[PDB]
Design a protein around this ligand. Structure first.
Ligand SMILES: Nc1nc2c(ncn2[C@@H]2O[C@H](COP(=O)(O)OP(=O)(O)O)[C@@H](O)[C@H]2O)c(=O)[nH]1
Length: 161
């Protein structure tokens, strides 16, 4: 059976855990590791997912997951300008550890249900275009875009392989 090791990166509080919980456990209420078998485009695969902001106690496990991670969600929140500004740092860190320029990634703008917005959709679209990766707007609360974000990433991993 095909396994995909996924890593969800981004600033603290952007909703990495919430997105992963919604995907895996199908709920939201207002664990950093998750493991579930799903079916994506008719292919069964086990998703092994780590949520990380880079500042956790288990750095050794982080570096491992970064090296073995096959695909990365780069998550910011639409109401957190700093988290959007942090994205370039995260992508640069991934490129460094993978020692590669072609790493599957998706840019995720979370908390799309909230009326406070400080990051324009255009800004995020423009950034994703520059990186050559998809941008997906999500809400862990409403489930908007959640499957699409993770499944698009899995599709990016297949394209890479
Ligand atoms: N309204 C709303 N709140 C969210 C969303 N995603 C996460 N949250 C809330 O944002 C806070 C931080 O989420 P969390 O998953 O712990 O962020 P993490 O540090 O990136 O893992 C929590 O209070 C969540 O309930 C979302 O899409 N919409």
């Amino acid at each position: 059976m095909t396994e995909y090791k996924l890593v969800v990166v981004g600033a603290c509080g952007v909703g990495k855990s919430a997105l992963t919980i919604q995907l895996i456990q199908n709920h939201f209420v207002d664990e950093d590791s998750y493991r579930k078998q799903v079916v994506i485009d008719g292919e069964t695969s086990l998703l092994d997912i780590l949520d990380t902001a880079g500042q956790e106690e288990y750095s050794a496990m982080r570096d491992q997951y970064m090296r073995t991670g096959e695909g990365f969600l780069l998550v910011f929140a639409i109401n957190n300008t700093k988290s959007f500004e942090d994205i370039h740092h995260y992508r640069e860190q991934i490129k460094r550890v993978k020692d590669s320029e072609d790493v599957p990634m998706v840019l995720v703008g979370n908390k799309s249900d909230l009326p406070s917005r400080t990051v324009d959709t255009k800004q995020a679209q423009d950034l994703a275009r520059s990186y050559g990766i998809p941008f997906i707007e999500t809400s862990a609360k409403t489930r908007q875009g959640v499957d699409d974000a993770f499944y698009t990433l899995v599709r990016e991993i297949r394209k890479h392989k």
